[PDB]
Symmetry: none
Subunit: 81 residues, 2 copies
Amino acid sequence: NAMVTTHDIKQWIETGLSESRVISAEGDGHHFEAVVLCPTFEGQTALTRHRLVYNALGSHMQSDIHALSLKTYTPDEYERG
Amino acid sequence: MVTTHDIKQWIETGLSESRVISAEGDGHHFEAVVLCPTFEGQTALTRHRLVYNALGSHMQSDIHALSLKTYTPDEYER
Ligand SMILES: [Co+2]
Ligand SMILES: [Co+2]
């Protein structure tokens, strides 16, 4: 997408990363924030959790999305919050 | 600055036994996915109106614009 929306960010991550839910996606076309839940993050460092997400966004991350800030939770970290 | 966290907090306070499972926003335009057992038997249009009313005076100026997807917990399970 030449002009990225928050609904893009949400669809692309859920498509690329199985069992993920983007519970919040915010931003203006250039700077975004996303809160991502995935049970696959269990036992993974914050850095790894973030990389799985950037990798799931594939070429969108490389070419379309200028900046993307993340909070990554397991479903359990989120419900126990 | 109004956030998707605000939207969720406000809908869940105002609309009883509802749950905002996801939300998007740019500061002015927002979307929320809302689950509530109440929505059973009600049309989409009715369910949207119920949520807008639940939000009360938040629509005046806090929330510039808001689209909705409204499901019963069950319909969401598929
Ligand atoms: Co910049
Ligand atoms: Co507007």
